Write a protein that binds this DNA or RNA. Sequence first.
RNA 1: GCCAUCAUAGUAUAGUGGUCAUUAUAAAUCGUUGUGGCCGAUUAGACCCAAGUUCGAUUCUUGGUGAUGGCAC
RNA 2: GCCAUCAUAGUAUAGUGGUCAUUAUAAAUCGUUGUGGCCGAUUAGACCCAAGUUCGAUUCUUGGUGAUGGCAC
Lengths: 238, 238, 238, 238
Amino acid sequence: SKYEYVKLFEKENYLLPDTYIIIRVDGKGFHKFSQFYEFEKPNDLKALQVMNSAAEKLMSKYSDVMLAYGDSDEYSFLLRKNCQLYERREMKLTTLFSSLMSTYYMYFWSQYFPDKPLHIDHLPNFDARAVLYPDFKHIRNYFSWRQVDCHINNLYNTTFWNLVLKLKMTPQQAEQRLMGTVASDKNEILFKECGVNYNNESEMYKKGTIIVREELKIYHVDIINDDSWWKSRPWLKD
Amino acid sequence: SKYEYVKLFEKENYLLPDTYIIIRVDGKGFHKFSQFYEFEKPNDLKALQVMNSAAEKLMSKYSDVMLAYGDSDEYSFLLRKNCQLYERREMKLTTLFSSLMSTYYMYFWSQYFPDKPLHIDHLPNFDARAVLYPDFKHIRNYFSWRQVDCHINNLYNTTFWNLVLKLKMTPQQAEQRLMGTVASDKNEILFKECGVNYNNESEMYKKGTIIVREELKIYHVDIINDDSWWKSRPWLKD
Amino acid sequence: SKYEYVKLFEKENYLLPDTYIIIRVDGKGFHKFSQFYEFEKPNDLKALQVMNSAAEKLMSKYSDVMLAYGDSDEYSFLLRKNCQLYERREMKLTTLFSSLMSTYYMYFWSQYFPDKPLHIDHLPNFDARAVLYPDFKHIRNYFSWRQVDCHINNLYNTTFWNLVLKLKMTPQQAEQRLMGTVASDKNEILFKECGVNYNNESEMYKKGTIIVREELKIYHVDIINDDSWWKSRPWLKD
Amino acid sequence: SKYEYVKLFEKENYLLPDTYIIIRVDGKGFHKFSQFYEFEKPNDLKALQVMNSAAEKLMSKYSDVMLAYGDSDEYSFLLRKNCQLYERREMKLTTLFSSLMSTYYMYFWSQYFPDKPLHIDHLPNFDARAVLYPDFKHIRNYFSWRQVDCHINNLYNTTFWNLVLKLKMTPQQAEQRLMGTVASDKNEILFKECGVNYNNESEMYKKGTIIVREELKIYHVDIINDDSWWKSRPWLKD
RNA sequence: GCCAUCAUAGUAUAGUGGUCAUUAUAAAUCGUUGUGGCCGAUUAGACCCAAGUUCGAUUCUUGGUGAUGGCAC
RNA sequence: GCCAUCAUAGUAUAGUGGUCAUUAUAAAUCGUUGUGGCCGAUUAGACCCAAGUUCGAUUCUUGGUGAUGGCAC
């Protein structure tokens, strides 16, 4: 054929072999999404259950996924160094992960929220990106990074929304109130001003969600400083 | 943060400026999908209407898409040379398209097929890839390629399914029958043995589907040899 | 063999077909190089003749190079868009261009400077990079860019070195003298203080060197605003 | 400037952090090169000494090079995983390595071969490629691969040339004689038919040349099966 | 890494130191009718990239690139 | 591209040709209770990358990388 030549312009990226692969998916414009569908704030439990359901189903479908961590609108999946899925093609992996997360999210949404049918102009969408890590210490530091981010964002949001919801403040007002404030200040604001003990908040909200292949087990725990949690799971490294 | 350093391992791909971008999305394992949901064969009208609906909605959402051509389980989107969406990041573009096509397909499926609710183990999934073309001649030759592919595949499928359904053959029998057969043989088989004139088959089935930005207009026409079709639409080149 | 598997870790990058390739080579640490070999200042004629000889030899050896422009320690090469050399493998092209430039430079140095044999710790070395340009306007703008750089640097260096040699100023003094000065001021300083008319400077020094495939002809001319120079040479475009 | 925008078309490749980098340089068309300058066959000592001298000089110039292995016209360089040279830019590294090897070879050739001045149409040129290895076992296996390749190729050329010289065979005759033969067969052919004991051949010829940072020490030894050789050198790993 | 063979239309195939350089399909237009099928007619499409030899090179000689077949890890 | 200035802990900040090299926040454990908040105490972490000079270099001299501020398209 005289038109097939265009196929030669395509460029495939084969991810470096024997390297841990992390795929992170993140919901597109989930702020506006949370606004439209009236999520409970700071954290909507059922929505996170939809996310976790999607992640668990996906992880159940692909044996190569060793570990999953997610919070808010994001989820990260660790693939074993030797994973041969789609011959380690970056494009296949990423677009497939985004498609799967989107569709699973839609399905489990139809299951958890029959009262809120999805509108065509607001559908859950996710991006996805692949990152290569040559050493497991970097994997540990990655998930540590994600959990710390969950910590910061959840604290910020809880203080913010308690200022907005429990107090009568405006989003702008609450935003300006927290400017240049650090974690300790946020907690003090929560207790003294909002009468809220952050430590008593749900373990899922503050620590995030971990899905591990053991069986697929779900935990909400600190993975940052607990070495024994990792040591007892050597198959993650292999 | 002591853990944020991992962000340095990410490698982004910014697509070459002033170049036409074609994003092709394709349904994952849609043969089995067509069997599970009992699609009409050779071509399922309503399924094709779902595809076209998803594509039209997506194209309507993003102004940078100048032209779209799709058939069967695939759809191709042409972005203007000057499209800067997401800083021309390949990962963002592809994962976003796969997610959007997946969700739009799910929605329009829920609309066209209320009788066939989607099963969790069968959801429509799509991959997506970005290909760069430096000159418009390559764009024309690309879409020409896709339409030729549509012609061949549709002819094959119509002949095949007319052999299994009409002549009451098994799929393997039709497979063996069409082994080593050429277009003339397929037309003659359809005509003489199945009593079917291919030219009278739906224009959408044999020519595929074209959605072009003019209002968004739908055509089923030959774009291969009709130069005037392209000439009359200079904004595609710009 | 049990050790060949490592070959799978190699990643080749094939440059987009039908695209103009510009390979730019630039001498590594040629300031120190020019100091070491006691180059004439502001401009050493024979060194630039070595550069030009090397470039001309390379261009003579590989027919795909349509045009070459170089000045100071750098040289840029335009490859026809349809160039299939080394299957458009980026690494092969770049490392071979740098290697060729280095060796040819060494050779022509041995010919032009027999009095100055090269020292093992100062050898001419070059880097090389490949750049893709989808439209010829970008090629024109590139060579325009390079020539403008040649003008600016030549004017600055001529004024500076005339201040150092003729006015016997120290480099730091001449440098402070030129602070906040513009082209008119530099020309005025040269003519009134140094008794030098810049307009009378060698065409090679101010305009750089252009080697174009006609037969290979060498020019020192303005290619920026002269459109007819390009128009009369359509084969550069093809 | 209105012309600087072209700089935006450049694409840099930053090699993945904390990964071992192997840069392999290989002489361009060195068969013809060896023929032109009338190299001793099967192995020319002085030329290999030029190669080794160039490599040792290069390794001496860059402290990041931990180990080098070369034979025939090829040389491989191992960079510590944490090497930051040129910010791990592939282009800079490869073009610099090819340029340096080319120039160093040119220099040492004039030292070893004053009788054979280099011809402009035959200058030593080298390509260079970068490969990333995430684990040291792959490094061990890489150098193992190169040494085995050296053994095999040396066996082939020595046997062929001995069949030509001792038995006065025609190249086609020697070629026909070696058809379907394996290493053991080649050794047996050499000893029985050509009257040459391969085991008595130069250690450089059979094992290649190893340059390791200890001081820079040169060895001709087996690194494939000797584990203690690697174990005693932990600094190679880090 | 080595030798042998080879480089032509979208694909697949014959030929030449010298006319508009073959043949078969595929492609484009017209006509007939069974439709885009079969048949008849017309049109369109190429000799890897350079140097050198020569009156003239797709040919011959050289170089560079690229591919297959063998043999060997 | 030019010049000035600068390179330390996760961040932000003092000082030295020579002891375990500051201080303030952030982080880790214990303790108090109002909670992971305030406060007390204990602990953890670093001087861009090489060479030369030197007994000894984070400091000086040189070079390479990176960043900011001014001036210029």
